[PDB]
Amino acid sequence: MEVKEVELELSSEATFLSKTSIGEITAGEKGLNPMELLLVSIGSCSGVDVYHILKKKRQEVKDIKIFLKGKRREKHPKIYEEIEIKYVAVGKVEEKALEQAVKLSTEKYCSVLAMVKPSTNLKISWEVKWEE
Amino acid sequence: MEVKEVELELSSEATFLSKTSIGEITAGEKGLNPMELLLVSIGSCSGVDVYHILKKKRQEVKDIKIFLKGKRREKHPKIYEEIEIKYVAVGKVEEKALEQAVKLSTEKYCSVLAMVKPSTNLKISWEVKWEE
């Protein structure tokens, strides 16, 4: 069982300097928004899967863009009642390969997404922009 | 319903420049680890609640340190089977006030934590270091 550890310390009003393996970032009221950071965690975790799978499937990737939009409940806790994720692969990428990468990620490999999936409505979409 | 949006773009091998409201950070294989970022999101979201509550309860806070440790499953998806969170309030803070702040956050206000709670075993602890 892999162990991950992070440590936070107050940096400014309701803001924390957050220590991770690659460095420290400020998260909170006067720093990176925590809920926006959750979307970043989801997007990057899944993006890593998609990148590796597309590569394994011999696709020529020039760029991968991921757009996440979350809609929050109005009462506490204000969790995301809905999260929309759109994957855009740019390059010589076949729609079938992108679809397989997105499904494998969202249904089997993405650890972050797997943890919040049971508490929100997930809407996933993707598209390829064929470019040389 | 508040809407949060973030956009990611490939920056390096399996890494993404992630655009948020305060700026851009690199998340992925060669940047901030996605699962570590999830812990940062949880810690900072809750930390914001604790800060505000302690302030409301008239506590004199010199510092707030939050330690998160996550243990991952060995098979995919490698979600955190357990997440330990330790809150340390430093200053003229009464243990009773910290306890109330931690419980209100973890049980009602923390949006990020509320979303992953149903998929993991949460172990919460706290302590005060009385300092002038």
Write out the DSSP string of B13-26: TTEEEEE-SS-EEE
Which tokens in the block code for residue B54?
């302690």
CB pairs under 8 A between A and B: 279
* C-alpha separations of A28 from A12, A17, B3 in Å: 9, 9, 17
The structure tokens listed for B1 are 């319903």
**Which of B11, B12, B40 should we substitute to test contact with A (largest number of A Cβ atoms within 10 Å)?**
B40
Q: Tell me if B72 sits within 8 A of B46, measured CB to CB.
A: no
How close, in Å, is residue B67 to chain A by CA atoms?
Answer: 5
| A82 vs A95: CA distance, rounded Å | 25
Domain boundaries, chain B: 1-132
Inspect the interface and report whether the beta carbons of B1 and A72 lie closer than 8 Å: yes
Rounded CA-CA distance A48/A45 in Å is 5
Its CATH class, for the domain covering A1-132, is: alpha beta
Give the separation between CA A25 and CA A33, rounded to whole angstroms: 11
Is B131 part of the contact surface with chain A (CB cutoff 8 Å)?
A: no
Q: Write the CB contacts of B66 (distance below 8 Å, at least 6 apart in sequence).
A: A7, A8, A9, A16, B43, B46, B47, B85, B86, B87, B88
Asked if B20 reaches chain A (Cβ–Cβ under 8 Å), the answer is yes
Decide if B36 and A114 are in contact by the 8 Å CB cutoff: no
In angstroms, what is the resolution? Answer: 1.7
Separation in Å, CA B29 to CA A1, B13, B125: 19, 7, 31
Would the CB atoms of B16 and A47 count as touching at under 8 Å?
yes
* Chain B environment of A25 (Cβ under 8 Å): 25, 32, 40
Torsion angles phi and psi, residue A96, rounded to 5:
-65, -35
| Phi, psi (degrees; rounded to nearest 5) at A113 | -60, -40
Measured between CA atoms, the residue of chain B closest to residue A5 is B69
